[PDB]
């Protein structure tokens, strides 16, 4: 499954949940978008702005469900 959206061209006028926020799909501090490379799912960490304020991109990161394997 490549990162490209075969169902979304990421138009500037329209926001895509796969390339943006799935929970709200809105523009909010997009630079702080966190996503698990194994999945195209991200976290409301930028929308909610929780104490985490940390980016695990330093190394490969897996979403909580990935580990629930």
């Amino acid at each position: 499954s490549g990162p490209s959206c075969k169902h979304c061209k990421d138009d500037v006028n329209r926001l895509c949940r796969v390339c943006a926020c799935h929970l709200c799909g809105g523009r909010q501090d997009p630079d702080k978008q966190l996503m698990c490379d194994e999945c195209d799912m991200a976290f409301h960490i930028y929308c909610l702005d929780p104490p985490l304020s940390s980016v695990p991109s330093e190394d490969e990161w897996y979403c909580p469900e990935c580990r629930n394997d």
Binding site: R14, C19, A20, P30, D31, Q33, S57
Partner: peptide, 12 residues
């Protein structure tokens, strides 16, 4: 990992 900053995109 896959940070994917996501370029700015809105109805703006």
């Amino acid at each position: 990992a896959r940070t994917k900053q996501t370029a700015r995109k809105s109805t703006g």
